[PDB]
Amino acid sequence: EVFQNETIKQILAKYRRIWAIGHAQSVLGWDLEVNMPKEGILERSVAQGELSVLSHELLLHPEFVNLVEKAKGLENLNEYERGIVRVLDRSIRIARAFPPEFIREVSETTSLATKAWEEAKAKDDFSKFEPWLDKIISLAKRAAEYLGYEEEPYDALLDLYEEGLRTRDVEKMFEVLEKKLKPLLDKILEEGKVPREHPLEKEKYEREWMERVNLWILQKFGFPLGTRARLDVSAHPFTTEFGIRDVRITTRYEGYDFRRTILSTVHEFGHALYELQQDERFMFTPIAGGVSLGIHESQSRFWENIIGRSKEFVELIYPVLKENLPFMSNYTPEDVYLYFNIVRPDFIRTEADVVTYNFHILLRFKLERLMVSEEIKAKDLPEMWNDEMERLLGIRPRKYSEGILQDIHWAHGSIGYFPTYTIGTLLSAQLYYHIKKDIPDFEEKVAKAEFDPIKAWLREKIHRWGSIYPPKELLKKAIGEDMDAEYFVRWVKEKYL
Template structure:
């Protein structure tokens, strides 16, 4: 490559990212709670070291940017590094250090506050995080709304105007679909299996079998553990890890978190190995990443074809299913109802949960909302969008880990993931036949060819236009939902 000098100089940055990923995975999976302070210091200093090494690349980036005649990979490397350099040159290091220290402690406090359903315990940390995120938005600069600066960190080029356009199209149409589903009664709004307890060890065995069905490379390039909030993290193209959680009842929750996180992991595992240790050897954006997880979780995992495959396994391992047939399990997996918890929400109502968080984040960053008002604001939004109100903070404002991590601008990418998953459903030939025939390798090959192998070579919108000739178009998702639930 013409930019080999730049890629060699980037290796220490990649190594720091690798070390940080391992430390962050350990924080969620293994670390005792009293280790939070030291881990925060370590992560803060790693961030400063990373910044120092990245800034050393500035002259090389400028040199190659102006050299011309770069191939697509090289152009992608320059684009990604320019974005990172903008971040580090715009934001003072003491702000980044303070954010790392605050969020590391906040993640631990959030777990305690959620367990106790006590927003007051978490409020000082969230207040500080919001203050820091406002500073970061100002330092990065923006046109229009200050939230645009944060949206762009997770979905390059995505703005409040784009998000408003997506939600303004989705919400009224989703409300119409939801009303029709509930009036026709073909899909239940509750199911007895939701209240049935399961043996955690048995369910762990079921999840391990699911990973085999999905052909995940367990033990060689992939592993699964347990954490308070399910997540995926990639150390490298040959070391990708997911977690799930076990709440003791309603077995579909842990099962679908495994399928969801496996979708994220597949993305990381199918990035072109030649991009390893380069700035483009990663997923292009959170929206595109989420499209992979939501596609596997919902379009495949909740389909009749997939239920037909896994029903014998479930019936064999879970004794309480002796009284439930395959159609019962399919309906249990596809309950449709307004509910309180985002991660358990069905396909039809899920995006209302994201719209709520989007409106709150937009207001917080603009300074129009106050952290102290969030519990009541949250409850009011839930009532307005879905007609339900949380009974406590754990069911409401404390249910997600993201704000404790400083991830403002992240939530809208969940809806983008659903939108893109709908597009993949429309574009992937003979999908139902492929699922029914367990031809998952063919599905993966399509996703590898259209999305995964490119890493971050192209911006998200450019990638989608190149592969699908469309981008953030909600019509595909709405058509999929109408076909499935109303067809």
């Protein structure tokens, strides 16, 4: 049926091994974050490392590569078998772009740069990270040259994290935002409409109280606990896929500002449903699973902001908040609403409300394009970052930790990664209007906890397709169009005005 071609089957049989190491890697990483006794880190680390080298070795074995090339030379193949090749061709390609020595240099430099960035952020000292940043800039440029690119070197890094993404693409969405979203922000901020803070941010809670609320929400979403999924705690919320029938998410309980653990759980749920609603006929194959960081963030943001910050979701959970939170006997559902939608330009990207968030990404985008294009100087980045923070949000970081040092991405060498976050926010808006068309009673269903039709709409349009088509081709096929920042602007307008 789905996999008929003989060359394709030989490939899938070998791929199983590669797939198994990956299954193992996920379990290792998840366990490292959720269960592992602290001192087990050295042995976990070497195990993770040996497998990554083993995995890479198997992907580039002559036999495997020969098969992919051969199949790539077949015209008989259906879309599914074709998806196998497109995906595997991109992997083998990316994997052999870097000389084994270069992969080594990066691992070394990266590891040491992360540690240096880690103390530098804590002690607010850019000098301790600066030289490491210059080394990472050089590695990024080299990487762009190893990967190859038509227009700009930055296209190669972007394409690394979002298949088919180009600098021109990113340049465009941010233009529409800077001229249409920026003013909307100013207007919102000056009418005193929504507040910049809320007393509910200070209300403390005991872990068990919120875990009762999160649990209730996940069951309302139909999250298949104990059967195909789990919810646990870890330093930072994430989602992992051990398989189509085994997807896990985590959240954290800060102990105060209950909005965090709630929306964070919902956010991760969005990622999970996606992996959960994959097509089982693709099990063990490279086409199963979310196609990219951007499409994945369109799902997490869809559930988090489109639904989670909506008045209806608030009414639905309101009674549960009252049952488990004592301090809730002093607030109304509107109080919870305003709380969930506060708007306030601030220093930290991970705390940015939905209206100011994308400006944190635009600046990282500008600095990144410059770093890999022109001959930018690390020692000069802090001020450029500061001037940009001031030009977009009116505030200026006073210390390195509130600014250029806040995120781990650069130290990890993840240059050309940040833009995928904006894509997700944008795409979540666009998807909302397309579903709002097939399900005009969208809001009413949320308020009543009737999510099946919404979950099914997402499946047919996005999920079941896995990695069959590249990100762009996937959107056209399912939404009749390409990403368009315009939707995010209307969503915001229609929500704050």
